[PDB]
Amino acid sequence: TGRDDTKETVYISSIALLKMLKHGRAGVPMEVMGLMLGEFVDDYTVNVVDVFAMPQSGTGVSVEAVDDVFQAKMMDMLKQTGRDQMVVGWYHSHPGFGCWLSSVDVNTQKSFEQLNSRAVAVVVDPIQSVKGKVVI
Amino acid sequence: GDDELDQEILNLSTQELQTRAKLLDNEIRIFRSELQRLSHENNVMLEKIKDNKEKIKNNR
Amino acid sequence: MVLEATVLVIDNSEYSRNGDFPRTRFEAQIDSVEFIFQAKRNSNPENTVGLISGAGANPRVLSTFTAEFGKILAGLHDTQIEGKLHMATALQIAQLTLKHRQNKVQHQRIVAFVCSPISDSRDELIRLAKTLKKNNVAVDIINFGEIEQNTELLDEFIAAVNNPQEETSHLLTVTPGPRLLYENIASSPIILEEGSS
């Protein structure tokens, strides 16, 4: 047999959720992004313990607007505070459009999937989170 | 060097001139501390402009 | 010695505005630090130096461990001399700085300048002296404060720290008379020091 892939449900800790909203709305309509720090345990649980934001650009998301130099410094900042675990993916915020990956975003995602196959992309809509529903 | 030569044999003793350069050794050990202090700050400053301008060219 | 992290404690005082040493003691200490950094770095460049002061009514970290020669130097530009070194708390604050290191291979060492007679209690400091070696911290005391007419509480501190341990406590007393503070300390074994295992 091969490897079988099966359901997962992404559990967004209360901390993680506020940060994405705060960073994403504030930077809208310019695209916002950041990495998700967390851990995978189980085979049905992606647990995102924390997120942070990586520096915005007016080229929005790009494969080279991810910026690993900044990722590396940030990782060492969590390491000294004893909070580093495993980066479980990336999130990005589309402005007022729906949740769907753009063609460019597919290739951004293809990169993180090499590094860890369990990586997700979490697409956020902040201007639509001012309903009684949060759209993510 | 308008001093510590045969001008200054007249003004004060030749032994004052022996020791005087050796009080200028303390004095340049201090000016060297301050000059190297200023080497480290100009090395950090220039790299702090690099950090700024890198975002700025992306937006530009 | 090699593979070593060193917290240098600089005693900040009005005793170091004294012109015994050249042309105050503080301006002599500026030169001394620069020399010490290079000595260790040319023995082994994986060594790092941290710097704390006595300045204030409580010690403070001016530099955590850094491989940067200029960060130590910058720290001295920031520090203020109207503060007074309190040695009991400075040892304890150094012990915490010595837990953080670039690598954990780097040994633990304190170097302490003394420019004032210490008026903390002997029995109080003898507890601390024995705490150091459990943490594997030895302490080199450059003494020129307690020799302006004062007893050696130090004699007891150095014996208590010494034990089988490659970190080895040293008592150095530096001629207070003009010969240039930095010259004597630099010329004194500091990278020719020995263990005790």
Could you characterize the architecture of this molecule?
This is part of a larger assembly, with chains A (136 residues), B (60 residues) and C (197 residues). Chain A has helices spanning 14-27, 68-80, 103-115, and strands at 9-12, 32-41, 45-51, 86-93, 120-124. Chain A is an alpha/beta fold and 136 residues long. Chain A has a five-stranded mixed beta sheet with strand order 1-3-2-4-5. Chain B is an all-alpha fold. Chain C is an alpha/beta fold and 197 residues long. Chain C is built from six helices and six strands. Chain C has a six-stranded mixed beta sheet with strand order 3-2-1-4-5-6, sandwiched between helices. The radius of gyration of chain C is 15 Å and the shape is globular. Classes of the chains: A alpha/beta (136), B mainly alpha (60), C alpha/beta (197). The interface between B and C is medium-sized, with 11 and 13 residues.
Keywords:
part of a larger assembly; 3 chains; A: 136 residues; alpha/beta; five-stranded mixed β-sheet; 29% helix; C: 197 residues; six-stranded mixed β-sheet; 6 helices; globular; Ubiquitin carboxyl-terminal hydrolase RPN11 (chain A); polyubiquitin modification-dependent protein binding (chain C); K48-linked polyubiquitin modification-dependent protein binding (chain C)
**Gap from first CA to last CA of chain C:** 14 Å
Largest sheet of chain C: 6 strands, mixed
Rg of chain A, rounded, reads: 15 Å
Strand order of the largest sheet of chain C: 3-2-1-4-5-6
Any idea what the shape of chain A is?
Answer: globular
Helical residue percent of chain C?
Answer: 25-40%
Order of helix and strand elements from N to C terminus of chain A: EHEEHEHE
Structural class of chain A: alpha/beta
Binned, the helix content of chain A reads 25-40%
Rough outline of chain C: globular
Alpha-carbon Rg of chain C, integer: 15 Å
Derived from helix and strand composition plus strand pairing, the structural class of chain C reads alpha/beta
Biggest sheet overview of chain A: 5 strands, mixed
Name the beta content range of chain A. 25-35%
Please name the two chains that share the biggest interface, counting residues whose Cβ lies under 8 Å from a Cβ on the partner chain. B-C, 11 and 13 residues
Quaternary structure state of the chains depicted: part of a larger assembly
From the N-terminal CA to the C-terminal CA of chain A, the straight-line distance is 35 Å
- Count of individual helical segments of chain A: 3
Please provide the count of β strands of chain C.
6
Helix and strand sequence of chain C: EHEEHHEHEHEH
Domain VWFA (chain C): 5-190
Function (chain C): Multiubiquitin binding protein.
Protein name (chain C): 26S proteasome regulatory subunit RPN10
GO cellular component, one term (chain C): proteasome complex
